[PDB]
Design an enzyme around this catalytic site. Structure first.
Site, PDB file in Angstrom:
ATOM      1  CG  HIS A 193      -9.846   4.036   2.106  1.00  0.00           C
ATOM      2  ND1 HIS A 193      -9.053   5.041   1.839  1.00  0.00           N
ATOM      3  CD2 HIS A 193     -10.429   4.288   3.439  1.00  0.00           C
ATOM      4  CE1 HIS A 193      -8.825   5.983   3.065  1.00  0.00           C
ATOM      5  NE2 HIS A 193      -9.852   5.481   3.880  1.00  0.00           N
ATOM      6  CG  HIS A 201      -0.106  15.207   0.574  1.00  0.00           C
ATOM      7  ND1 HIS A 201      -0.747  14.148   1.279  1.00  0.00           N
ATOM      8  CD2 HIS A 201      -1.198  15.108  -0.514  1.00  0.00           C
ATOM      9  CE1 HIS A 201      -1.909  13.604   0.815  1.00  0.00           C
ATOM     10  NE2 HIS A 201      -2.425  14.328  -0.384  1.00  0.00           N
ATOM     11  CG  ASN A 214      -5.043   7.723  -4.706  1.00  0.00           C
ATOM     12  OD1 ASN A 214      -3.799   7.046  -5.026  1.00  0.00           O
ATOM     13  ND2 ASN A 214      -5.117   8.475  -3.466  1.00  0.00           N
ATOM     14  CG  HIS A 271      -1.952   1.195   1.138  1.00  0.00           C
ATOM     15  ND1 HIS A 271      -3.254   0.798   1.509  1.00  0.00           N
ATOM     16  CD2 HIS A 271      -2.091   2.478   0.757  1.00  0.00           C
ATOM     17  CE1 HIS A 271      -4.058   1.948   1.503  1.00  0.00           C
ATOM     18  NE2 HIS A 271      -3.207   3.027   0.937  1.00  0.00           N
ATOM     19  CG  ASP A 304      -2.193   5.045   3.576  1.00  0.00           C
ATOM     20  OD1 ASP A 304      -2.289   5.485   2.431  1.00  0.00           O
ATOM     21  OD2 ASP A 304      -2.793   5.632   4.323  1.00  0.00           O
ATOM     22  CG  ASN A 310      -9.265   8.751   5.379  1.00  0.00           C
ATOM     23  OD1 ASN A 310      -9.684   8.382   6.369  1.00  0.00           O
ATOM     24  ND2 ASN A 310      -9.934   8.994   4.463  1.00  0.00           N
TER      25      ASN A 310
HETATM   26 ZN   LIG Z   1      -3.990   4.758   1.136  1.00  0.00          ZN
END
Ligand SMILES: [Zn+2]
Ligand SMILES: [Ca+2]
Ligand SMILES: [Ca+2]
Ligand SMILES: [Cl-]
Ligand SMILES: [Cl-]
EC number: 3.5.2.3
Length: 422
Positions: free
Chosen positions: A177, A307, A92, A58, A303, A276
Protein backbone atom coordinates in the site's frame (compact mmCIF):
# COMPACT_ATOMS: atom_id res chain seq x y z
CA UNK A 1 -20.96 -35.66 -8.84
CA UNK A 2 -22.60 -32.51 -10.24
CA UNK A 3 -23.51 -31.37 -13.77
CA UNK A 4 -24.07 -27.77 -14.84
CA UNK A 5 -26.44 -27.97 -17.79
CA UNK A 6 -27.24 -25.18 -20.32
CA UNK A 7 -24.47 -22.64 -19.60
CA UNK A 8 -22.42 -20.65 -22.13
CA UNK A 9 -18.61 -20.44 -22.02
CA UNK A 10 -16.04 -18.13 -23.65
CA UNK A 11 -13.99 -19.53 -26.56
CA UNK A 12 -11.59 -16.87 -27.95
CA UNK A 13 -13.92 -13.85 -28.01
CA UNK A 14 -17.40 -15.36 -28.24
CA UNK A 15 -19.93 -17.09 -25.99
CA UNK A 16 -20.65 -20.73 -26.84
CA UNK A 17 -23.00 -23.51 -25.67
CA UNK A 18 -21.34 -26.04 -23.35
CA UNK A 19 -22.31 -28.44 -20.51
CA UNK A 20 -19.93 -29.06 -17.58
CA UNK A 21 -19.53 -32.33 -15.66
CA UNK A 22 -18.01 -32.06 -12.16
CA UNK A 23 -16.38 -34.86 -10.19
CA UNK A 24 -15.87 -33.92 -6.52
CA UNK A 25 -13.46 -30.93 -6.35
CA UNK A 26 -12.42 -30.94 -10.02
CA UNK A 27 -14.30 -30.73 -13.31
CA UNK A 28 -14.21 -33.99 -15.30
CA UNK A 29 -15.34 -32.54 -18.75
CA UNK A 30 -16.58 -29.53 -20.89
CA UNK A 31 -18.75 -30.77 -23.74
CA UNK A 32 -21.42 -29.33 -26.16
CA UNK A 33 -23.59 -32.09 -24.51
CA UNK A 34 -23.35 -34.65 -21.69
CA UNK A 35 -25.91 -37.18 -20.30
CA UNK A 36 -26.06 -37.79 -16.49
CA UNK A 37 -25.29 -41.09 -14.67
CA UNK A 38 -25.87 -42.06 -10.98
CA UNK A 39 -26.44 -39.81 -7.95
CA UNK A 40 -26.11 -36.73 -10.11
CA UNK A 41 -26.96 -33.42 -8.45
CA UNK A 42 -28.51 -31.13 -11.09
CA UNK A 43 -27.77 -27.45 -11.71
CA UNK A 44 -29.66 -25.78 -14.57
CA UNK A 45 -27.74 -22.69 -15.73
CA UNK A 46 -30.63 -21.78 -18.10
CA UNK A 47 -28.61 -20.22 -20.96
CA UNK A 48 -26.55 -17.98 -18.65
CA UNK A 49 -22.82 -17.34 -19.02
CA UNK A 50 -20.47 -19.66 -17.13
CA UNK A 51 -17.16 -18.04 -16.12
CA UNK A 52 -14.08 -19.24 -14.25
CA UNK A 53 -14.39 -18.01 -10.65
CA UNK A 54 -13.02 -14.50 -10.07
CA UNK A 55 -9.86 -14.07 -8.04
CA UNK A 56 -9.50 -11.05 -5.72
CA UNK A 57 -6.00 -10.42 -4.45
CA UNK A 58 -7.01 -7.57 -2.13
CA UNK A 59 -9.86 -7.90 0.37
CA UNK A 60 -10.41 -7.06 4.00
CA UNK A 61 -12.17 -9.82 5.94
CA UNK A 62 -11.83 -7.90 9.27
CA UNK A 63 -11.89 -11.04 11.44
CA UNK A 64 -9.96 -11.45 13.72
CA UNK A 65 -10.40 -8.15 15.61
CA UNK A 66 -13.09 -6.40 13.55
CA UNK A 67 -15.95 -8.93 13.52
CA UNK A 68 -18.66 -6.24 13.84
CA UNK A 69 -17.52 -4.79 10.50
CA UNK A 70 -17.21 -8.16 8.74
CA UNK A 71 -16.43 -11.81 9.55
CA UNK A 72 -14.63 -14.44 7.45
CA UNK A 73 -18.09 -16.04 6.96
CA UNK A 74 -19.93 -12.88 5.82
CA UNK A 75 -16.94 -11.61 3.85
CA UNK A 76 -16.49 -14.81 1.83
CA UNK A 77 -20.27 -15.10 1.42
CA UNK A 78 -20.11 -11.61 -0.16
CA UNK A 79 -17.17 -12.69 -2.34
CA UNK A 80 -19.11 -15.72 -3.65
CA UNK A 81 -22.17 -13.53 -4.43
CA UNK A 82 -19.80 -11.33 -6.46
CA UNK A 83 -18.61 -14.41 -8.36
CA UNK A 84 -15.26 -14.66 -6.57
CA UNK A 85 -14.00 -18.13 -5.61
CA UNK A 86 -10.54 -17.09 -4.34
CA UNK A 87 -9.77 -14.02 -2.22
CA UNK A 88 -6.57 -12.93 -0.47
CA UNK A 89 -7.26 -11.05 2.74
CA UNK A 90 -4.97 -8.26 3.94
CA UNK A 91 -3.09 -8.48 7.28
CA UNK A 92 -4.41 -5.38 9.05
CA UNK A 93 -6.28 -7.45 11.63
CA UNK A 94 -5.82 -8.06 15.38
CA UNK A 95 -3.84 -10.21 15.84
CA UNK A 96 -1.73 -9.54 12.74
CA UNK A 97 -0.71 -12.70 10.82
CA UNK A 98 2.98 -12.17 11.62
CA UNK A 99 3.83 -15.44 13.39
CA UNK A 100 3.21 -19.20 13.16
CA UNK A 101 0.91 -18.93 16.22
CA UNK A 102 -1.17 -16.20 14.54
CA UNK A 103 -1.18 -17.91 11.11
CA UNK A 104 -2.36 -21.21 12.60
CA UNK A 105 -5.17 -19.43 14.51
CA UNK A 106 -6.20 -17.78 11.23
CA UNK A 107 -6.13 -20.94 9.11
CA UNK A 108 -8.43 -22.52 11.70
CA UNK A 109 -10.91 -19.64 11.34
CA UNK A 110 -10.67 -20.11 7.56
CA UNK A 111 -11.23 -23.87 7.83
CA UNK A 112 -14.27 -23.28 10.06
CA UNK A 113 -15.82 -20.23 8.35
CA UNK A 114 -14.61 -19.39 4.83
CA UNK A 115 -17.13 -20.03 2.08
CA UNK A 116 -14.50 -19.54 -0.66
CA UNK A 117 -10.74 -20.18 -0.99
CA UNK A 118 -8.80 -17.80 1.22
CA UNK A 119 -5.08 -17.21 0.59
CA UNK A 120 -3.96 -14.97 3.43
CA UNK A 121 -1.32 -12.29 3.23
CA UNK A 122 1.32 -12.12 5.95
CA UNK A 123 2.59 -8.76 7.21
CA UNK A 124 6.16 -7.80 6.38
CA UNK A 125 6.89 -6.88 10.00
CA UNK A 126 5.82 -7.78 13.55
CA UNK A 127 2.43 -6.21 14.39
CA UNK A 128 2.83 -4.12 11.22
CA UNK A 129 4.92 -1.77 13.43
CA UNK A 130 7.66 -1.69 10.78
CA UNK A 131 10.48 -2.37 13.29
CA UNK A 132 11.17 -6.15 13.00
CA UNK A 133 10.85 -8.45 9.98
CA UNK A 134 8.66 -11.54 10.37
CA UNK A 135 10.00 -15.09 9.78
CA UNK A 136 9.46 -15.39 6.02
CA UNK A 137 10.13 -19.15 5.46
CA UNK A 138 8.10 -19.93 8.61
CA UNK A 139 5.03 -18.07 7.27
CA UNK A 140 5.27 -19.43 3.75
CA UNK A 141 5.03 -22.88 5.37
CA UNK A 142 1.79 -21.84 7.07
CA UNK A 143 0.27 -20.77 3.77
CA UNK A 144 1.27 -17.11 3.39
CA UNK A 145 0.17 -15.76 -0.02
CA UNK A 146 2.42 -12.69 0.01
CA UNK A 147 4.13 -10.29 2.45
CA UNK A 148 2.32 -7.06 2.68
CA UNK A 149 2.89 -3.49 3.75
CA UNK A 150 -0.53 -2.34 4.87
CA UNK A 151 -1.04 0.26 7.63
CA UNK A 152 1.65 2.33 9.33
CA UNK A 153 4.50 -0.16 8.83
CA UNK A 154 7.88 -0.15 7.04
CA UNK A 155 9.26 3.34 7.69
CA UNK A 156 12.80 3.21 6.27
CA UNK A 157 14.13 2.17 2.87
CA UNK A 158 16.54 -0.24 4.67
CA UNK A 159 13.69 -2.23 6.27
CA UNK A 160 11.76 -2.42 2.93
CA UNK A 161 15.00 -3.54 1.25
CA UNK A 162 15.70 -6.23 3.83
CA UNK A 163 12.04 -7.30 3.66
CA UNK A 164 12.38 -7.69 -0.09
CA UNK A 165 15.59 -9.70 0.15
CA UNK A 166 13.67 -12.14 2.44
CA UNK A 167 10.74 -12.39 0.00
CA UNK A 168 13.13 -12.99 -2.89
CA UNK A 169 14.61 -15.90 -0.81
CA UNK A 170 11.15 -17.50 -0.48
CA UNK A 171 9.93 -16.67 -4.01
CA UNK A 172 6.98 -14.55 -2.76
CA UNK A 173 5.80 -11.02 -3.60
CA UNK A 174 6.14 -7.93 -1.49
CA UNK A 175 2.76 -6.22 -1.81
CA UNK A 176 2.63 -2.57 -0.84
CA UNK A 177 0.00 0.00 0.00
CA UNK A 178 2.08 2.95 -1.23
CA UNK A 179 1.66 5.82 1.23
CA UNK A 180 4.43 8.14 2.53
CA UNK A 181 3.47 9.03 6.11
CA UNK A 182 4.85 12.61 6.11
CA UNK A 183 2.85 13.40 2.95
CA UNK A 184 -0.63 12.36 4.15
CA UNK A 185 -1.07 15.82 5.73
CA UNK A 186 -4.14 14.62 7.67
CA UNK A 187 -5.96 14.42 4.34
CA UNK A 188 -9.23 12.58 3.84
CA UNK A 189 -9.67 12.80 0.04
CA UNK A 190 -7.83 13.86 -3.14
CA UNK A 191 -6.01 17.24 -2.87
CA UNK A 192 -7.49 19.11 -5.82
CA UNK A 193 -10.45 21.26 -6.93
CA UNK A 194 -13.09 19.36 -4.99
CA UNK A 195 -11.26 19.27 -1.64
CA UNK A 196 -10.96 23.05 -1.86
CA UNK A 197 -14.67 23.42 -2.76
CA UNK A 198 -15.65 21.28 0.24
CA UNK A 199 -13.09 22.63 2.73
CA UNK A 200 -11.84 19.11 3.46
CA UNK A 201 -8.11 18.37 3.79
CA UNK A 202 -6.63 16.53 0.82
CA UNK A 203 -3.92 13.97 0.16
CA UNK A 204 -1.42 14.94 -2.58
CA UNK A 205 -0.64 12.52 -5.41
CA UNK A 206 2.98 12.42 -4.17
CA UNK A 207 1.94 10.60 -0.99
CA UNK A 208 1.59 7.47 -3.17
CA UNK A 209 3.97 7.89 -6.11
CA UNK A 210 7.12 8.56 -4.09
CA UNK A 211 6.82 5.20 -2.34
CA UNK A 212 6.32 3.36 -5.61
CA UNK A 213 9.37 5.13 -7.07
CA UNK A 214 11.51 4.07 -4.04
CA UNK A 215 10.20 0.45 -3.85
CA UNK A 216 10.73 -0.38 -7.55
CA UNK A 217 14.45 0.43 -7.08
CA UNK A 218 14.58 -1.51 -3.85
CA UNK A 219 12.85 -4.40 -5.61
CA UNK A 220 15.32 -4.26 -8.48
CA UNK A 221 18.31 -4.46 -6.11
CA UNK A 222 16.75 -7.29 -4.04
CA UNK A 223 15.60 -9.15 -7.19
CA UNK A 224 12.07 -9.60 -5.87
CA UNK A 225 8.52 -9.42 -7.14
CA UNK A 226 7.03 -6.13 -6.02
CA UNK A 227 3.26 -5.56 -6.40
CA UNK A 228 1.65 -2.13 -6.13
CA UNK A 229 -1.81 -2.13 -4.49
CA UNK A 230 -4.74 -0.08 -5.86
CA UNK A 231 -2.95 2.52 -8.03
CA UNK A 232 -4.71 5.92 -8.07
CA UNK A 233 -2.46 8.64 -9.57
CA UNK A 234 -1.25 9.47 -13.07
CA UNK A 235 2.37 9.71 -11.87
CA UNK A 236 2.22 6.30 -10.13
CA UNK A 237 1.24 4.78 -13.47
CA UNK A 238 4.21 6.50 -15.14
CA UNK A 239 6.62 5.23 -12.56
CA UNK A 240 5.36 1.64 -12.98
CA UNK A 241 5.55 1.85 -16.77
CA UNK A 242 9.19 3.12 -16.50
CA UNK A 243 10.01 0.39 -13.95
CA UNK A 244 8.59 -2.38 -16.15
CA UNK A 245 10.50 -0.97 -19.13
CA UNK A 246 13.72 -1.22 -17.04
CA UNK A 247 13.07 -4.97 -16.60
CA UNK A 248 12.06 -4.72 -12.90
CA UNK A 249 9.53 -7.33 -11.67
CA UNK A 250 6.81 -4.93 -10.52
CA UNK A 251 3.11 -5.62 -11.07
CA UNK A 252 0.11 -3.53 -10.12
CA UNK A 253 -3.65 -3.62 -9.59
CA UNK A 254 -6.50 -1.07 -9.95
CA UNK A 255 -9.89 -1.12 -8.11
CA UNK A 256 -13.35 -0.87 -9.75
CA UNK A 257 -14.11 2.45 -8.03
CA UNK A 258 -10.88 4.10 -9.26
CA UNK A 259 -11.79 3.04 -12.85
CA UNK A 260 -15.32 4.37 -12.50
CA UNK A 261 -15.27 7.47 -10.29
CA UNK A 262 -13.32 10.67 -9.67
CA UNK A 263 -13.29 13.51 -7.15
CA UNK A 264 -16.09 15.11 -9.22
CA UNK A 265 -18.46 12.31 -8.21
CA UNK A 266 -18.24 13.25 -4.52
CA UNK A 267 -21.54 15.08 -3.82
CA UNK A 268 -20.44 16.66 -0.53
CA UNK A 269 -18.89 15.87 2.83
CA UNK A 270 -19.83 12.20 2.60
CA UNK A 271 -17.65 9.44 4.09
CA UNK A 272 -19.34 6.91 1.83
CA UNK A 273 -16.96 8.38 -0.78
CA UNK A 274 -13.99 8.16 1.58
CA UNK A 275 -11.45 5.47 0.71
CA UNK A 276 -7.62 5.17 0.60
CA UNK A 277 -6.27 5.90 -1.97
CA UNK A 278 -8.92 8.57 -2.64
CA UNK A 279 -10.86 9.12 -5.86
CA UNK A 280 -8.60 11.51 -7.74
CA UNK A 281 -8.89 13.74 -10.82
CA UNK A 282 -10.29 13.02 -14.31
CA UNK A 283 -6.64 13.07 -15.50
CA UNK A 284 -5.65 10.46 -12.93
CA UNK A 285 -8.55 8.14 -13.90
CA UNK A 286 -7.68 8.53 -17.55
CA UNK A 287 -4.13 7.41 -16.67
CA UNK A 288 -5.32 4.33 -14.77
CA UNK A 289 -7.60 3.27 -17.57
CA UNK A 290 -4.80 3.77 -20.09
CA UNK A 291 -2.47 1.78 -17.81
CA UNK A 292 -4.82 -1.16 -17.37
CA UNK A 293 -5.35 -1.22 -21.12
CA UNK A 294 -1.65 -1.15 -22.18
CA UNK A 295 -0.72 -3.67 -19.42
CA UNK A 296 1.16 -1.34 -17.08
CA UNK A 297 -1.52 -2.22 -14.53
CA UNK A 298 -1.84 -6.02 -14.46
CA UNK A 299 -5.26 -6.76 -13.03
CA UNK A 300 -8.29 -5.55 -11.05
CA UNK A 301 -8.68 -6.07 -7.29
CA UNK A 302 -11.49 -4.65 -5.10
CA UNK A 303 -9.96 -3.52 -1.82
CA UNK A 304 -13.30 -4.63 -0.30
CA UNK A 305 -13.21 -2.58 2.91
CA UNK A 306 -16.28 -3.15 5.12
CA UNK A 307 -17.06 -0.73 7.96
CA UNK A 308 -19.99 -0.30 10.33
CA UNK A 309 -22.91 2.02 9.49
CA UNK A 310 -22.42 4.53 12.35
CA UNK A 311 -18.72 4.76 11.48
CA UNK A 312 -19.32 5.67 7.86
CA UNK A 313 -22.14 8.05 8.74
CA UNK A 314 -19.61 10.48 10.29
CA UNK A 315 -18.01 13.44 8.42
CA UNK A 316 -15.08 12.56 6.12
CA UNK A 317 -12.62 14.09 8.56
CA UNK A 318 -13.60 11.52 11.24
CA UNK A 319 -14.77 8.43 9.30
CA UNK A 320 -12.62 5.40 8.45
CA UNK A 321 -11.36 4.90 4.92
CA UNK A 322 -12.94 2.19 2.78
CA UNK A 323 -15.84 0.96 0.66
CA UNK A 324 -17.22 -2.59 0.13
CA UNK A 325 -16.76 -4.00 -3.38
CA UNK A 326 -16.88 -7.80 -3.66
CA UNK A 327 -20.58 -7.97 -4.50
CA UNK A 328 -20.63 -5.08 -6.99
CA UNK A 329 -17.28 -5.36 -8.85
CA UNK A 330 -18.24 -7.39 -11.97
CA UNK A 331 -21.77 -6.03 -12.51
CA UNK A 332 -20.54 -2.42 -12.31
CA UNK A 333 -17.61 -3.03 -14.66
CA UNK A 334 -19.61 -5.21 -17.05
CA UNK A 335 -22.41 -2.61 -17.31
CA UNK A 336 -20.11 0.42 -17.75
CA UNK A 337 -17.33 -0.90 -19.98
CA UNK A 338 -18.73 -3.98 -21.72
CA UNK A 339 -22.46 -3.39 -22.19
CA UNK A 340 -22.01 0.40 -22.44
CA UNK A 341 -18.48 0.68 -23.92
CA UNK A 342 -15.41 -0.68 -25.75
CA UNK A 343 -14.36 -3.61 -23.50
CA UNK A 344 -15.17 -7.21 -24.45
CA UNK A 345 -16.64 -9.67 -21.97
CA UNK A 346 -13.40 -11.65 -22.43
CA UNK A 347 -11.22 -8.61 -21.66
CA UNK A 348 -13.22 -7.88 -18.51
CA UNK A 349 -13.20 -11.52 -17.33
CA UNK A 350 -9.39 -11.73 -17.85
CA UNK A 351 -8.73 -8.76 -15.47
CA UNK A 352 -10.59 -10.69 -12.75
CA UNK A 353 -9.38 -14.27 -13.33
CA UNK A 354 -6.27 -15.17 -15.34
CA UNK A 355 -4.40 -11.83 -14.85
CA UNK A 356 -4.51 -11.91 -11.06
CA UNK A 357 -3.35 -15.54 -11.33
CA UNK A 358 -0.54 -14.84 -13.82
CA UNK A 359 0.63 -12.00 -11.52
CA UNK A 360 1.12 -14.27 -8.51
CA UNK A 361 1.83 -17.51 -10.37
CA UNK A 362 -1.46 -19.05 -9.20
CA UNK A 363 -3.11 -22.10 -10.75
CA UNK A 364 -6.72 -20.78 -10.81
CA UNK A 365 -8.54 -18.34 -13.13
CA UNK A 366 -9.30 -20.85 -15.85
CA UNK A 367 -12.31 -22.86 -16.81
CA UNK A 368 -10.50 -25.97 -18.03
CA UNK A 369 -10.92 -29.71 -17.58
CA UNK A 370 -8.83 -30.98 -14.64
CA UNK A 371 -8.92 -27.55 -13.13
CA UNK A 372 -10.88 -27.09 -9.90
CA UNK A 373 -14.64 -26.68 -10.22
CA UNK A 374 -14.25 -22.95 -9.41
CA UNK A 375 -17.15 -21.34 -11.27
CA UNK A 376 -19.76 -18.62 -11.25
CA UNK A 377 -22.96 -18.46 -13.25
CA UNK A 378 -23.88 -14.95 -14.32
CA UNK A 379 -27.11 -13.39 -15.66
CA UNK A 380 -25.94 -11.01 -18.44
CA UNK A 381 -29.32 -9.72 -19.70
CA UNK A 382 -31.44 -8.81 -16.67
CA UNK A 383 -31.15 -5.53 -14.80
CA UNK A 384 -30.91 -5.35 -10.99
CA UNK A 385 -30.67 -2.30 -8.69
CA UNK A 386 -27.81 -2.37 -6.19
CA UNK A 387 -29.28 -2.38 -2.65
CA UNK A 388 -27.71 -2.78 0.81
CA UNK A 389 -30.56 -5.17 1.68
CA UNK A 390 -29.11 -7.68 -0.84
CA UNK A 391 -25.52 -7.57 0.45
CA UNK A 392 -24.31 -10.79 2.09
CA UNK A 393 -21.52 -8.67 3.63
CA UNK A 394 -22.34 -7.27 7.10
CA UNK A 395 -21.61 -3.80 5.70
CA UNK A 396 -23.14 -1.44 3.10
CA UNK A 397 -20.64 1.42 2.88
CA UNK A 398 -20.56 2.01 -0.90
CA UNK A 399 -21.32 4.87 -3.29
CA UNK A 400 -22.72 2.36 -5.80
CA UNK A 401 -26.04 1.83 -4.05
CA UNK A 402 -28.86 2.70 -6.45
CA UNK A 403 -26.85 1.93 -9.60
CA UNK A 404 -28.70 -0.25 -12.11
CA UNK A 405 -26.52 -3.11 -13.36
CA UNK A 406 -26.37 -6.08 -15.71
CA UNK A 407 -24.06 -9.11 -15.39
CA UNK A 408 -25.21 -10.35 -11.97
CA UNK A 409 -23.91 -13.65 -10.52
CA UNK A 410 -26.69 -16.12 -9.65
CA UNK A 411 -24.53 -19.06 -8.53
CA UNK A 412 -20.96 -19.56 -7.33
CA UNK A 413 -19.22 -22.89 -6.80
CA UNK A 414 -15.89 -23.51 -5.01
CA UNK A 415 -14.20 -26.90 -5.54
CA UNK A 416 -17.50 -28.43 -6.65
CA UNK A 417 -19.52 -27.08 -3.71
CA UNK A 418 -22.32 -24.60 -4.44
CA UNK A 419 -21.39 -21.66 -2.20
CA UNK A 420 -23.96 -19.10 -3.37
CA UNK A 421 -27.33 -19.30 -5.04
CA UNK A 422 -29.27 -16.07 -5.72
ZN1 LIG B 1 -6.67 -2.10 1.22
CA1 LIG C 1 -12.26 22.56 6.77
CA1 LIG D 1 -25.93 -7.80 4.52
CL1 LIG E 1 -10.60 -19.52 -8.49
CL1 LIG F 1 4.25 -4.61 7.81
Amino acid sequence: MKLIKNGKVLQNGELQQADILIDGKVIKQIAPAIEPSNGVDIIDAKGHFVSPGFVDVHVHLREPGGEYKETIETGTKAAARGGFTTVCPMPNTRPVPDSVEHFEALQKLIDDNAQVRVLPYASITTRQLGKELVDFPALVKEGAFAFTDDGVGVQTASMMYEGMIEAAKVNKAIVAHCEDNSLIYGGAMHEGKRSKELGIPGIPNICESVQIARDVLLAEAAGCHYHVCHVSTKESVRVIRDAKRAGIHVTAEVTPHHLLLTEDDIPGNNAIYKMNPPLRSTEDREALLEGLLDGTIDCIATDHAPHARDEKAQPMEKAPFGIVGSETAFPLLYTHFVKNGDWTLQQLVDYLTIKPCETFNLEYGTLKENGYADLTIIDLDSEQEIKGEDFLSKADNTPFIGYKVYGNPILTMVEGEVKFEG
